[PDB]
């Protein structure tokens, strides 16, 4: 379960808060996916006291709420159950932004990708097997996979990487458009398993 309480002393009506919250939640919490299990209790609240007496431009209020939520998501990812790797899955070159998000989640949730990651293994094969199941526009012969900026798969085949560190970026380009999206996730560790079984 993810609970979050936001507060502000900016002067803002409920409609102003709703916009800032819905934009931030779409970009941040909605793209945080640790173990692919969505809870019965998730809640995010945003309250204003207006104690500053200052009404911000809406764009600035939105940006402030986004920065807070995004940093909170970073903190949630860093303390996830059994975390050993802090993983970002970026999909670029999709037909649409939604396609990229769907692809990224498919990869992030996949149990063989997550275990390869726990093992510090730049296993692009498992990434391709995963993304191949995404319900989106896909050309297998146009896909590239990178781990920490190093291309290991290009044009859907192995290119002619040390993942020992905790931070891992996987970047997959689909070469079928300009849609892009990014998911924060983690690996599937013995620690995850033990915490959730014992």
């Amino acid at each position: 379960t993810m609970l979050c309480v936001l507060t502000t002393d900016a002067a803002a009506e409920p409609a102003a808060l709703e916009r800032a919250l819905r934009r931030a939640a779409a970009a941040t919490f909605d793209r945080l996916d640790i173990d692919g299990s969505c809870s019965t209790n998730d809640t995010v609240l945003l309250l204003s006291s207006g104690a500053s007496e200052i009404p911000p431009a809406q764009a600035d209020l939105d940006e402030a709420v986004l920065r807070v939520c995004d940093d909170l998501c970073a903190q949630l990812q860093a303390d996830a159950e059994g975390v050993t790797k802090r993983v970002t899955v970026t999909v670029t070159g999709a037909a649409t932004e939604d396609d990229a998000l769907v692809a990224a989640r498919q990869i992030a949730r996949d149990s063989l990708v997550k275990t390869a990651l726990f093992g510090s293994d730049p296993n692009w094969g498992r990434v391709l097997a995963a993304v191949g199941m995404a319900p989106i526009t896909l050309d297998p012969d146009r896909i590239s996979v990178s781990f920490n900026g190093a291309a290991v798969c290009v044009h859907g085949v192995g290119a002619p990487v040390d993942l020992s560190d905790a931070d891992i970026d996987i970047t997959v380009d689909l070469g079928v458009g300009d849609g892009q999206a990014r998911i924060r996730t983690t690996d599937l560790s013995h620690a995850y398993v033990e915490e959730n079984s014992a």
Partner: protein, 193 residues
């Protein structure tokens, strides 16, 4: 001039008090009940909630309350989700909000239950220990304050399997601030509306 800083939370902006107490909901004795209180002058609120078709009592309650766009307080517990607990679980949620409203009203600020958001987190399927929770409610209203440690305690009290609390505040150069706290380390794939 704008500063985004960790180690600050819900009481960073003006007009908010918070606290966390150990109410004995958790067998361990750890902090497990948080309160966040808006001092005014304004009470604007917005909220988004799980898109899970199975929603806990406190989600159903708070979804209803947010239709007003107004909040005085948020009461949050760990040590139990109050989820899949049926009408009796929803009655407990209502009773918590009423108890917070009564404690605040007695403390000096006239509040109705409809102005109190309720959140819970923990095991699904058990009912809440109401004697402990209601005793905790009275306690936490008398501990809340505007200091940063009040925010810290509230952040600690909402933790379940978390090892550290999660807090941040954005200080805008135009002299307003957004503060936040969060928890969640597992069953963590939000889909909010």
């Amino acid at each position: 001039t704008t500063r985004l800083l960790r180690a600050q939370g819900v009481t960073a902006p003006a007009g908010f008090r918070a606290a966390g107490v150990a109410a004995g909901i958790k067998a361990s004795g750890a902090l497990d009940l948080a309160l966040v209180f808006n001092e005014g002058p304004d009470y604007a609120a917005a909220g988004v909630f799980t898109r899970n078709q199975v929603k806990a009592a406190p989600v159903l309650w708070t979804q209803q309350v947010l239709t007003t766009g107004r909040l005085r307080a948020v009461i949050l517990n760990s040590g139990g989700a109050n989820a899949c607990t049926g009408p009796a679980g929803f009655a407990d949620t209502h009773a918590t909000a009423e108890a917070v409203a009564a404690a605040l009203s007695d403390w000096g600020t006239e509040t109705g239950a409809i102005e109190v958001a309720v959140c819970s987190t923990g095991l699904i399927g058990d009912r809440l220990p109401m004697d402990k929770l209601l005793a905790g409610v009275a306690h936490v209203v008398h501990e809340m304050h505007g200091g940063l440690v009040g925010g810290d305690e509230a952040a600690h009290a909402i933790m379940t399997t978390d090892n550290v609390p999660k807090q941040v505040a954005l200080h805008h150069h135009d002299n307003w601030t957004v503060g936040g706290m969060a928890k969640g380390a597992g069953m963590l794939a939000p889909s909010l509306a």
